Amino acid sequence: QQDPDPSQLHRSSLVKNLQNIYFLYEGDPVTHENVKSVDQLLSHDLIYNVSGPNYDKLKTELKNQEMATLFKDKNVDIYGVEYYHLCYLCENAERSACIYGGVTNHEGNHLEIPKKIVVKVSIDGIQSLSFDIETNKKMVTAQELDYKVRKYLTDNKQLYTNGPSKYETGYIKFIPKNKESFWFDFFPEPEFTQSKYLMIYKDNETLDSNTSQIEVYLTTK
Amino acid sequence: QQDPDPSQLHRSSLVKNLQNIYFLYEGDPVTHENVKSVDQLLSHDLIYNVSGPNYDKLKTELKNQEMATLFKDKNVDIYGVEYYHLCYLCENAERSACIYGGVTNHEGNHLEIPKKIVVKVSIDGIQSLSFDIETNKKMVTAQELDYKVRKYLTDNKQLYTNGPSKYETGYIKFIPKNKESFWFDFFPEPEFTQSKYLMIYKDNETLDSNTSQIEVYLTTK
């Protein structure tokens, strides 16, 4: 049994300040095209000189040093859900943003036309809702896909709100073409930190956009 | 206190990451009308349960323990220049904003007609620039007027930019009706932090909007 069970899943009704998870998926994601790491804090992270409405430096934390050097100084694209609480490169990183993973090679990884993907959503067992998600990458991180999914469901199904969720449990499952499938829980532990919760993107898991499937499971009450 | 000394003024040409001062005065200030503090980290601060983009909890550092309990149970108005780096580090509040002072009692501090105040500006000794500023508060913090003067000079005379300033030095001089006058240096020391610099507002100095005057002195590179 690789897939979770009722008891394994976190209940949104026990979470304090679940609005923090809400603000992460409701707001825009950090996206950048064809950039190169300019610095490094620890051996398993990389820093980029890119900018967004609230930052001019972005620090991504990857699986380990091997993955960091694998992408260091190499031309890559960034797609990630960022946080600010407890993020900085010292008392000399006034406007930094942090994320985990969300890194993909830029060269030869784009599609002419976006590749739409169906997201099968089940609620209390009943698979009663399906929608489309799209990407421009041949190899897209699970994080990019995940965000687009939770963003859509946050706007259209109140998966998240500045407060409670109308759902009790929920989780996203990715089914790779031949590799093993994996999942992420939509809700954190009762007392959590944005930084700890986002570690789920730390492994930088990437997928083949043309052959991967996505499944969401929600429970109400 | 006594007017600044030519050699006592910080030079923007020496500042590292001056764009950090830019973002402070370019973006919107934090303002709230009828609110009572809700919590308190240290005895000299007050936490408010108000929000804006990026934050839903605001912490203001006042002069001392005495000033905080003075407003603790009061409905007040807020007007401050907020920062986030090294703001509220307690993994139980991940969306806090921080300002210094900027507090005034709400009750009976409102004018039916806004008070215009003439800000006179000198550039290299020549007083060649005048422009109005306004407030609704009978008693207004120096911080509010200071922010309005910089935002205006930032968007109209290039006081700050996402890079260097066209001015090497510059200070704002407040001249209360009877009390001693005082000033604030528009620029920080070479290496600094938004948190440190903003301490110029920690005393929460408030002026009479009807009898106070403002003077600005800048020099070109």
Ligand SMILES: [Zn+2]
């Ligand atoms: Zn690209």
Ligand SMILES: [Zn+2]
């Ligand atoms: Zn008021």
